[PDB]
Amino acid sequence: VLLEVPFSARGDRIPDAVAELRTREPIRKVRTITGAEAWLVSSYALCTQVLEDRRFSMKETAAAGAPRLNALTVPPEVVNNMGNIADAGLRKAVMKAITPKAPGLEQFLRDTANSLLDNLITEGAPADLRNDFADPLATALHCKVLGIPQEDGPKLFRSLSIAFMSSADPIPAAKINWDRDIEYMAGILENPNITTGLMGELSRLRKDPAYSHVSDELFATIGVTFFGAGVISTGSFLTTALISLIQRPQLRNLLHEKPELIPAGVEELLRINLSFADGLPRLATADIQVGDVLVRKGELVLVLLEGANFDPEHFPNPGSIELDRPNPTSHLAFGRGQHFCPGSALGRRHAQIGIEALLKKMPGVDLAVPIDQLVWRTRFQRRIPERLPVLW
């Protein structure tokens, strides 16, 4: 049979097959869960080529009749969300609202992490570091960043186990949740009490004549999409980074003893992270040579992030965490090119503060079950354990 993607939902180890593929066929034909054919790209060189050539288009993946990685979970126009934000003149305001350096935000993150951890310690081991630490921390962070009530976070969070599904077919619950969450964000924009964060700023610009013909639809869409992408990405990254750290007691102890090394540690944890369950999809808008393959206009290309990030040509001894690499931020964990993650700095800070807090409170943190007992979520856009049971 034609090789099927994805290879494994496990986020604790890279399949031996990725390295064989990278060496022998760094661009290779595969079949996606929809039955469509696609080109899987797995070397640093070819992954960077695709992501830096805008003729491999994110927007066009949404075209009717295209070969699909998975079913849309947002309206087709929303696949071009960042381009819509740019065209509306809103990129700078969005970026300023989501920087980790906003006054009080870092201290809020620290206080929230420490309170979550104190609750776990009071209750006693075992603790679930995903559902009762990493995801709540992500959720609290994004409510603060958006300027919305903390008590609204849990309901918004509960859309995400459906919103970020990677499904062969359209998902009826995804539309129900999308429409409801859009209505929530539209109400937020009409709420005079919402004056801070991303939604407070968007509410102001919505009433500013310089933005008078931006649609109410776009303003609410920004709220739903930034909450969803930010929460799912940060909660999932921190969860799987904590596994990688628990798997490395020598590194855990070093970062505990020398917390000034945590930023370098988080950068390597980003590099080796397996959180993205599928390659990043793009549709060719011209015939383009990629390695030994002439990709044809209309074909689907999938950029495998761990293909690039474990490439031994670019990252020697790729499975080893090294805090002194000469090319440390040159990984693709945040993508590359036109669609580079707009939340990258906030995502770094969320993980840095979360790990700093956990190592101080739980220096002896260890898995409370054998690692093979973790239950890896399937048919999802991220690789995550359903529960992360730890002791300390």
Ligand X SMILES: Fc1ccc(-c2ccc(/C=C/Cn3ccnc3)cc2)cc1
Residues in contact with ligand HEM by CB under 6 A are 58, 81-82, 98, 225-226, 229-230, 233-234, 237, 275, 280, 333-335, 339, 341-343, 346-347
Give the helix ranges, DSSP H, for the chain: 16-24, 44-52, 81-87, 91-97, 105-123, 135-146, 153-157, 160-163, 172-189, 197-206, 216-246, 249-257, 262-271, 305-309, 344-361
Which residues within the stretch 257-276 sit at the binding site for ligand X (CB under 6 A)?
none
- What does residue 191 show for φ and ψ, rounded to 5 degrees? -90, 110
> Which of 42, 225, 240, 244 contacts ligand X by CB under 6 A?
225
Stretch that binds ligand X, among 113-121, 144-152, 175-183, 197-205 (CB under 6 A): 175-183
Placement of tokens 């080796």 in the chain: 272
- DSSP-based three-state secondary structure for 258: coil
Residue 343 contact, options ligand HEM, ligand X, none, Cβ 5-8 Å cut-off depending on partner type: ligand HEM
Stretch that binds ligand X, among 33-41, 222-230, 261-269, 362-370 (CB under 6 A): 222-230
| CA distances (Å), origin 115, targets 136, 155, 233, 238 | 11, 21, 22, 17
Rule CB under 6 A: say whether 306 interacts with ligand X: no
Give CA 372 to chain center in angstroms. Answer: 24
Rule CB under 6 A: say whether 61 interacts with ligand X: no
Distance of alpha carbon 22 from alpha carbon 271, whole angstroms: 17
Residue 39 contact, options ligand HEM, ligand X, none, Cβ 5-8 Å cut-off depending on partner type: none
Pair 11, 300: CB distance under 8 Å: no
Number of residues that bind ligand X (CB under 6 A): 13
- DSSP-based three-state secondary structure for 64: coil
Residue 74 contact, options ligand HEM, ligand X, none, Cβ 5-8 Å cut-off depending on partner type: ligand X
Cβ 99 to ligand HEM shortest distance, Å? 10
> Which of 33, 90, 214, 224 contacts ligand X by CB under 6 A?
224
Q: Which is nearer to ligand X, 56 or 178 (CB)?
A: 178
Residue 174 contact, options ligand HEM, ligand X, none, Cβ 5-8 Å cut-off depending on partner type: ligand X
Amino acid making up residue 340: F
Distance of alpha carbon 110 from alpha carbon 364, whole angstroms: 20
Rule CB under 6 A: say whether 112 interacts with ligand X: no
Greatest C-alpha distance within the chain: 60
Rule CB under 6 A: say whether 71 interacts with ligand X: no
Distance of alpha carbon 7 from alpha carbon 297, whole angstroms: 26
Six token digits for residue 196: 């801070």
Closest-CB residue for ligand HEM?
343
Distance of alpha carbon 103 from alpha carbon 122, whole angstroms: 30
Residue 61 contact, options ligand X, ligand HEM, none, Cβ 5-8 Å cut-off depending on partner type: none
- Cis? peptide before 15, omega within 30° of 0: no
- What does residue 293 show for φ and ψ, rounded to 5 degrees? -115, 135
Q: Which is nearer to ligand HEM, 162 or 301 (CB)?
A: 301
Residue 334 contact, options ligand X, ligand HEM, none, Cβ 5-8 Å cut-off depending on partner type: ligand HEM
Which residues within the stretch 143-172 sit at the binding site for ligand X (CB under 6 A)?
159, 163
Distance of alpha carbon 378 from alpha carbon 10, whole angstroms: 9
Rule CB under 6 A: say whether 307 interacts with ligand X: no
> Which of 129, 229, 359, 362 contacts ligand X by CB under 6 A?
229
Rule CB under 6 A: say whether 135 interacts with ligand X: no
The binding site for ligand X (CB under 6 A) comprises 73-74, 159, 163, 174, 177-178, 181, 224-225, 228-229, 233
Binding residues for heme: 282, 339, 341
